[PDB]
Amino acid sequence: MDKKILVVDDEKPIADILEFNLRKEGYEVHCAHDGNEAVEMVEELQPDLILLDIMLPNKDGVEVCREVRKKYDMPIIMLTAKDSEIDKVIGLEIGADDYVTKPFSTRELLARVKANLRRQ
Numbered sequence: 001m002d003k004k005i006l007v008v009d010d011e012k013p014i015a016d017i018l019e020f021n022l023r024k025e026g027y028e029v030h031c032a033h034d035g036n037e038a039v040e041m042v043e044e045l046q047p048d049l050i051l052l053d054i055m056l057p058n059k060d061g062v063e064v065c066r067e068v069r070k071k072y073d074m075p076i077i078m079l080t081a082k083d084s085e086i087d088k089v090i091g092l093e094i095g096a097d098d099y100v101t102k103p104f105s106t107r108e109l110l111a112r113v114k115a116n117l118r119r120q
Helices: 012-024 035-043 060-069 085-093 106-117
Strands: 004-008 028-032 049-053 076-081 098-102
Touching: 004 012, 004 035, 012 028, 012 106, 028 035, 035 049, 035 060, 049 060, 049 106, 060 076, 060 085, 076 085, 076 106, 085 098, 098 106
Parallel strands: 004 028, 004 049, 049 076, 076 098
Antiparallel strands: none
8 A cells, every 4th residue: 555645736847756756766646736636636535645836826735735624634745935934834834734845855855755644
């Protein structure tokens, strides 16, 4: 039973590199490119962790996080820019469990995903 990860990002390039490296590490990965699709997939897939771009189609990252939390407790990691402090802080305030700044190394990505899947 491979851990299931939902990558929610509209930047095909970054989204695809996340999928490449996670599958390579042995995760079962699914991708969503907009909020609605994500919330949809979340229910009929129930991923063990969601990687969520905070800047989806208009603040949707925060809104996606809020909706999902209205019914699910799985770890959510926000993907944010390096130069905005508020983008990093806001997610943890509304239900997300962690954040990772771009650009990020594969080493950081995998460590963050595993640490969050195994959080006490």
